[PDB]
Amino acid sequence: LYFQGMRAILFDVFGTLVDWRSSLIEQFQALERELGGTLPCVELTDRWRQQYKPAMDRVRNGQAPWQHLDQLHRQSLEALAGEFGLALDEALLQRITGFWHRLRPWPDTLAGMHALKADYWLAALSNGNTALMLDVARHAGLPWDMLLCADLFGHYKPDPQVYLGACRLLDLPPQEVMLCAAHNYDLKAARALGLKTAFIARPLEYGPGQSQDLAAEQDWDLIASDLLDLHRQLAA
Amino acid sequence: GMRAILFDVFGTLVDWRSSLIEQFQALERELGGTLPCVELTDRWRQQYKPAMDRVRNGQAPWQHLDQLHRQSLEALAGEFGLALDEALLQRITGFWHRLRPWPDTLAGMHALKADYWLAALSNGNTALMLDVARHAGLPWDMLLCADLFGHYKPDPQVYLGACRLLDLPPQEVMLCAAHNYDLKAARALGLKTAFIARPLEYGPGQSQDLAAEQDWDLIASDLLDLHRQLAAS
Ligand SMILES: [Cl-]
Ligand SMILES: [Cl-]
Numbered sequence: 492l493y494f495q496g497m498r499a500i501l502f503d504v505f506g507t508l509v510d511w512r513s514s515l516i517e518q519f520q521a522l523e524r525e526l527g528g529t530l531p532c533v534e535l536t537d538r539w540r541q542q543y544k545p546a547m548d549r550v551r552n553g554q555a556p557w558q559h560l561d562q563l564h565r566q567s568l569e570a571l572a573g574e575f576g577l578a579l580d581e582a583l584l585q586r587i588t589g590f591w592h593r594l595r596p597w598p599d600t601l602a603g604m605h606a607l608k609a610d611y612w613l614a615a616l617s618n619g620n621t622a623l624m625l626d627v628a629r630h631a632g633l634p635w636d637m638l639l640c641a642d643l644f645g646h647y648k649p650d651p652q653v654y655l656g657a658c659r660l661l662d663l664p665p666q667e668v669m670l671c672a673a674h675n676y677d678l679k680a681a682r683a684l685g686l687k688t689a690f691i692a693r694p695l696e697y698g699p700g701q702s703q704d705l706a707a708e709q710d711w712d713l714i715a716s717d718l719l720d721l722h723r724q725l726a727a
Numbered sequence: 728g729m730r731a732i733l734f735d736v737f738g739t740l741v742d743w744r745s746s747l748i749e750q751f752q753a754l755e756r757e758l759g760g761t762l763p764c765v766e767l768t769d770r771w772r773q774q775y776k777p778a779m780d781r782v783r784n785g786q787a788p789w790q791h792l793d794q795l796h797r798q799s800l801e802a803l804a805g806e807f808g809l810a811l812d813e814a815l816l817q818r819i820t821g822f823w824h825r826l827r828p829w830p831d832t833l834a835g836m837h838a839l840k841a842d843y844w845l846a847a848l849s850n851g852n853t854a855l856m857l858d859v860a861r862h863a864g865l866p867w868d869m870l871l872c873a874d875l876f877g878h879y880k881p882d883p884q885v886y887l888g889a890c891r892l893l894d895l896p897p898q899e900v901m902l903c904a905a906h907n908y909d910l911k912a913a914r915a916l917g918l919k920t921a922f923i924a925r926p927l928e929y930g931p932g933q934s935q936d937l938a939a940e941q942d943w944d945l946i947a948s949d950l951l952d953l954h955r956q957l958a959a960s
């Protein structure tokens with residue numbers, strides 16, 4: 492009842508709800524134990540997360556044709572298995588690319604989603620393609636009403652088509668939809684299209700080094716410490 | 728060799744007829760007078776069919792099922808004399824948002840989901856399907872509805888668009904439905920098919936879809952027996 496119009500909460504998923512960095516590191520180390528000796532887990536994980544952007548913006552700007560996030564993960568992984576000089580059979584490239592499909596939830600994510608679902612539709616709003624988000628959902632137990640991913644719309648966030656398409660599929664005006672995210676760039680794009688905004692800081696997403704998105708950069712509608720606290724603030 | 732099950736929803740999973748009539752009865756026990764409850768339910772689907780055929784064949788522009796239910800009801804109100812409030816047209820249009828599962832639906836789905844992705848493949852728009860899922864407790868992985876693709880079944884865009892979003896070849900996807908026309912369209916596009924007869928969908932008078940018209944990949948008496956046939960192999 493904090494608004495009363497607001498009926499759906501869209502969520503960003505990577506970083507906001509799941510700790511991709513820990514999960515990838517962990518999966519790299521299980522691999523190093525199976526292969527012969529050491530792999531550079533941290534450096535691979537951290538570089539991979541940045542490597543596809545030029546290629547994502549490439550897609551955005553029309554420079555290159557549509558590829559979904561699984562494909563960009565595949566590409567970028569090949570490019571730096573090169574640089575870093577590990578050779579990979581197709582069976583391994585497929586396996587490593589699918590690392591992003593099994594990601595650990597933050598301690599609050601599950602409980603908070605189960606709390607919020609009573610009063611609100613919950614939907615994923617991810618750059619992850621639908622099939623990748625289905626696997627992430629099942630591994631972590633995320634209780635989605637719907638998944639509204641980039642590949643439904645042929646755009647990556649923050650293209651306005653993503654937010655607008657989500658609201659179109661939910662059959663809601665923007666002002667009745669809230670985006671919850673850990674990243675101010677996402678919230679900034681949603682606000683400009685009339686969406687409500689809830690920010691949850693995830694200061695460990697990028698590890699002990701993290702410098703970005705430590706705090707709210709605008710007066711988002713709700714600022715919450717975690718998803719259950721978002722639920723508390725929403726019900727009052 | 729098989730990774731996802733697409734389900735038709737109205738009829739196949741949920742008993743819409745009994746649910747609408749039931750809600751029509753309760754509306755009587757609140758209002759003044761009586762309504763043509765059974766009569767109305769039975770005319771409503773036929774009522775929008777023209778509208779849909781006109782969306783499909785281009786003679787009209789994209790309306791979703793919700794909108795179609797609304798326009799059709801209004802027309803049924805005119806016919807039967809009924810003076811219906813904007814609020815009441817909305818509530819009655821909303822009867823489709825709350826539909827009761829068949830007795831096998833929920834456990835059968837909870838069993839099937841362990842092994843397969845479960846996705847709704849419905850003429851219902853996304854938002855209507857969301858209400859139906861939540862009221863009934865349907866555990867979907869995904870909803871692949873008509874409004875996502877801009878097309879109503881049996882247009883090939885629905886089936887083949889579904890498979891592409893699941894990133895799966897048609898052959899690794901099965902459609903489960905109580906309606907032979909749905910399976911027929913899916914089978915011609917390469918999908919696997921499961922048929923489950925729902926002889927009471929349309930009431931004691933039911934004459935269509937009482938049996939399998941083709942040798943569908945599976946023919947099952949309910950979702951549980953389907954689970955059992957798939958476990959067997
Ligand atoms: Cl995401
Ligand atoms: Cl349906």
Ligand code: NA
Nearest residue numbers: 770771773774
């Ligand atoms: Na009629």
